[PDB]
Amino acid sequence: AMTNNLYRLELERECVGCNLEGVNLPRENFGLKYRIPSPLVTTPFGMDKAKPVDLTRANLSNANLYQSDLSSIILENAILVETNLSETDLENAILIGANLQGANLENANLQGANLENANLRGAILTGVNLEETHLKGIETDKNTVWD
Numbered sequence: 610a611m612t613n614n615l616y617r618l619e620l621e622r623e624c625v626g627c628n629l630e631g632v633n634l635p636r637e638n639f640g641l642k643y644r645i646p647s648p649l650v651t652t653p654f655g656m657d658k659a660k661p662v663d664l665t666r667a668n669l670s671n672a673n674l675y676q677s678d679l680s681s682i683i684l685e686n687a688i689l690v691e692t693n694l695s696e697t698d699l700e701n702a703i704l705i706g707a708n709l710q711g712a713n714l715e716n717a718n719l720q721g722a723n724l725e726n727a728n729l730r731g732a733i734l735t736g737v738n739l740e741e742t743h744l745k746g747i748e749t750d751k752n753t754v755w756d
């Protein structure tokens with residue numbers, strides 16, 4: 610049940626293999642940079658001992674993650690076809706073997722992110738921060754947009 614998946618995400622910080630196709634989770638915080646204990650109380654302190662959200666083999670196709678924090682997230686072998694990842698924070702994220710076909714990553718931050726063997730066919734990466742981003746083995750095509 611979706612309710613159970615959301616619980617595992619909020620509490621267990623994971624949802625391996627979950628089916629989250631088309632979910633609407635914009636502006637959420639699934640990263641390791643900050644925490645909100647009043648949405649301005651946001652602070653990085655207290656994150657020294659926190660685990661990264663695990664979404665290995667998860668299906669987030671066509672899901673909306675607009676402006677969500679996904680820093681250090683684990684999306685290994687995840688399915689993200691046509692997913693809205695624009696303006697998301699994917700710093701140090703693990704996207705090994707991820708399927709990002711037709712995904713929208715506009716203005717997303719991918720610093721230190723690992724996208725080895727990831728599929729970027731038709732994906733849009735305009736304005737993306739590729740500083741120290743591992744792009745070894747990625748797949749692209751005439752539809753892949755970089756600018």
Ligand SMILES: [As]
Pocket residue numbers: 748749750
């Ligand atoms: As190609």
